[PDB]
């Protein structure tokens, strides 16, 4: 047991993921509102591993503070709209993927 | 409201848990049979765990016993961990948001 370490790592990754997911939605808007800003964001995203949430944001500060603040807000909105539905959706999907994989391989043995 | 973002996040979470499972199993192996740990190491270089179904399928051509072990461990990990995350990530984001905000606003001064 002790699934606690795995939980800490998972929650971190999720935090970074949702950040990514916000940056994504924002870049979708910019591509339509302020295309230069949009491309700036892409070029920034290439210089910085977005999956380092905090490093990514601390770096962003030093270059475009309005955007950083926007992400922090958009991510948290996403966080609230999405989080409760996750344990159901994943566990259900895992069971299903587990199903198909077992059938697939347990049948592959007869081939 | 953000169903398409829920979909993509769950899919990631699925693969992430698959990843985390391969990581426990990889630790056990490294003790039990070094030979397989090395193998599993480079298997993961040739196949991206992030696309997990494709990963598991490719593994079937090589180590079906393990594919099966992964499926069991990943579901266990799921059980232990999933229900805790929405309190965790939320309260984490909030904290983080706070610290970034403070830190940004204090730079505007200093």
């Amino acid at each position: 047991m002790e699934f606690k370490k795995v939980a800490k790592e998972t929650a971190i990754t999720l935090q970074s993921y949702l950040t990514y997911q916000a940056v994504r939605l924002i870049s979708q808007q910019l591509s339509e509102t302020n295309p230069g800003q949009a491309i700036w964001l892409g070029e920034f995203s290439k210089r910085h591993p977005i999956q380092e949430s905090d490093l990514y944001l601390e770096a962003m500060m030093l270059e475009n503070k309005e955007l950083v603040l926007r992400i922090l807000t958009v991510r948290e909105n996403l966080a609230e709209g999405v989080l409760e539905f996750l344990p159901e959706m994943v566990l259900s999907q895992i069971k299903q993927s587990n199903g198909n994989h077992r059938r697939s391989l347990l049948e592959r043995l007869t081939q | 409201e953000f169903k398409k973002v829920a979909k993509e996040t769950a899919i990631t979470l699925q693969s992430y848990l698959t990843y985390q499972a391969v990581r426990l199993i990889s630790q056990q192996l490294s003790e039990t049979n070094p030979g397989q740990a090395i193998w599993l190491g480079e298997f993961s270089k040739r196949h991206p765990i992030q696309e997990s179904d494709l990963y598991l399928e490719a593994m079937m051509l090589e180590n079906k016993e393990l594919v099966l072990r992964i499926l069991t461990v990943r579901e266990n990990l799921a059980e232990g961990v999933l229900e805790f995350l929405p309190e965790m990530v939320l309260s984490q984001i909030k904290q983080s948001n706070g610290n970034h905000r403070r830190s940004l606003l204090e730079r505007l001064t200093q």
């Binding site: 870049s27 999956q51 | 992430y16 992030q50």
Partner: peptide
């Protein structure tokens, strides 16, 4: 595309 990857 901005990509997300788990290190």
């Amino acid at each position: 595309e901005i990509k997300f990857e788990f290190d």
